[PDB]
Write a protein that binds this ligand. Structure first.
Ligand SMILES: Cn1c(=O)c2c(ncn2[C@H]2CN(C(=O)[C@@H](N)Cc3c[nH]c4ccccc34)C[C@H](O)C[C@]2(C)O)n(C)c1=O
Ligand SMILES: C[S@@+](CC[C@H](N)C(=O)[O-])C[C@H]1O[C@@H](n2cnc3c(N)ncnc32)[C@H](O)[C@@H]1O
Ligand code: NA
Ligand code: NA
Ligand SMILES: [Zn+2]
Ligand SMILES: [Zn+2]
Lengths: 115, 300
């Protein structure tokens, strides 16, 4: 019945003025990539930064189990594209947002399947 | 001059041929820093330049390539170098990393513990080591060849590096080992490579290119480290981050290098020639299995 809710704890810590998790590993890249959210190699476009996935995963960084029943990590071993305006808090961004299952872009940050 | 637009500087061949005595390393540019792009960590930049330089060598790049990375953890609890290696290496490359202390990593498997506890069934195509103990930078005592993890690395190379494979091993003025330099002569080619972002440091990567499994050349490692320090002492390297802004040719080219299993009796000069040119890897192609020894203790 009981299970720590790390996702909720980080959001509340942020809302009350906490410093976002640091030392997410930012990659060098051309910034001419597809702009998709989560990729096997950095794909930032001109408006994004690419980060090593594991360093942007709340569960990886906090040393706690992943919410997936299999304990699989969506980010580890991959690269996550974060909008430049949100790159001060990549863990918060990946936590709060969701990836369009059709085009692979972030909902509301690239995905246009709704027009 | 033109060196500031390169990823770094490799030790020129003439310095390798000297017979210098070991001196203190005194870097004119000591304490300078390069200007890193906004938000980029020193270790991302350093690994990026190491990979850009490795792109200019004749690395074997087979399908199902196997790379192991020692000293992969940072005091930040993450693995910046591993992230760059994974970016650099072809998608699907098996990447294992390791460190003494816990860290979160993008590698396919991570082993935590002293490197001497690491065992692998299989052989590897590329070994990268950033292992370093800052307690070696003691300028008050004599600077002798060091053992510790360097003893492990030499043994690991001789037992677990595929023929045709390559290595890049971090050394410094005081963190070095004579047998490792000697082992450089068991590759078709070798160098000590200084990254332009960290050129104010005596750090270098000792790079052995295409392993042959026997001495092609006899190298005295105490002399060669003296030669390396001589080179560093007399050739200031201008700090530079210029190469970090051009990543269009960064990915390691997937050459599909051939992998064959062969027995020591069959390594003829034709084979040795293909090894030397980056055109062949010799090892089994079984599954990759690793483990770390755990010491068991009951303190009650
Ligand atoms: C440990 N070590 C060196 O220690 C070293 C060095 N290469 C050169 N030095 C210099 C250092 N140094 C400078 O170069 C100054 N610009 C920088 C500096 C300003 N404040 C300091 C306070 C403490 C230490 C340094 C400084 C001053 C002096 O010359 C001493 C010395 C040993 O030779 N290398 C490769 C090396 O590994
Ligand atoms: C310079 S740090 C590398 C971290 C850097 N941020 C990166 O991305 O690689 C060097 C590492 O060597 C490791 N190390 C030193 N001696 C070791 C040993 N005997 N066995 C295993 N790791 C060792 C330390 O834990 C240390 O983190
Ligand atoms: Na040192
Ligand atoms: Na190789
Ligand atoms: Zn994770
Ligand atoms: Zn979409």
């Amino acid at each position: 019945a009981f299970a720590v809710d790390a996702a909720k704890a980080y959001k509340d810590y942020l809302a009350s003025g906490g410093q976002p998790i640091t030392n997410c590993v930012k990659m060098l890249c051309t910034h001419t990539g597809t702009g998709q959210a989560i990729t096997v190699t950095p794909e930032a476009n001109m408006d994004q930064e690419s980060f090593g996935g594991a360093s942007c995963c709340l569960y990886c960084r906090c040393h706690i189990d992943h919410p997936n029943p299999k304990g699989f990590c969506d980010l580890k071993g991959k690269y996550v594209q974060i909008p430049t305006t949100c790159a001060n808090d990549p863990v918060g961004f990946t936590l709060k947002n969701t990836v369009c299952t059709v085009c692979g872009m972030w909902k509301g940050y690239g995905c246009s399947c709704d027009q | 001059s033109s060196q500031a637009w390169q990823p770094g500087v490799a030790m020129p061949n003439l310095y390798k041929m000297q017979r210098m005595l070991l001196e203190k390393c005194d870097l004119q540019n000591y304490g300078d820093s390069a200007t890193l792009p906004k938000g980029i960590m020193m270790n991302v930049a350093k690994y990026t330049q190491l990979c850009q330089y490795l792109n200019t060598l004749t690395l074997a790049v087979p399908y199902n390539m196997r790379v192991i990375h020692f000293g992969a953890g940072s005091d930040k609890g993450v693995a910046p170098g591993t992230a760059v290696l994974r970016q650099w290496l072809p998608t699907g490359t098996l990447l294992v990393d390791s460190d003494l202390n816990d860290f979160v990593s993008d590698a396919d498997s991570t082993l935590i513990g002293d490197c001497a506890t690491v065992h692998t069934a299989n052989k590897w195509d590329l070994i990268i080591s950033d292992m370093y103990d800052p307690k070696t930078k003691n300028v008050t005592k004599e600077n002798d060849s060091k053992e510790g993890f360097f003893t492990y690395i030499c043994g690991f190379i001789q037992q677990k590096l595929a023929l045709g494979g390559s290595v890049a091993i971090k050394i410094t003025e005081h963190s070095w080992n004579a047998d490792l330099y000697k082992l450089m002569g068991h590759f078709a080619w070798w160098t000590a490579f200084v990254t332009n972002v960290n050129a104010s440091s005596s750090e270098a990567f000792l790079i052995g290119c295409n392993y042959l499994g026997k001495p092609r050349e006899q190298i005295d490692g105490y002399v060669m480290h003296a030669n390396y320090i001589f080179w560093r002492n007399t050739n200031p390297i201008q700090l530079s981050s210029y190469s970090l802004f051009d990543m269009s040719k960064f990915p390691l080219k997937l050459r599909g290098t051939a992998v064959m299993s062969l027995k020591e009796g069959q390594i003829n000069d034709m084979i040795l020639s293909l090894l030397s040119k980056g055109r062949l890897i010799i090892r089994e192609n079984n599954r990759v299995v690793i483990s770390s020894d755990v010491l068991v203790n009951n303190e009650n």
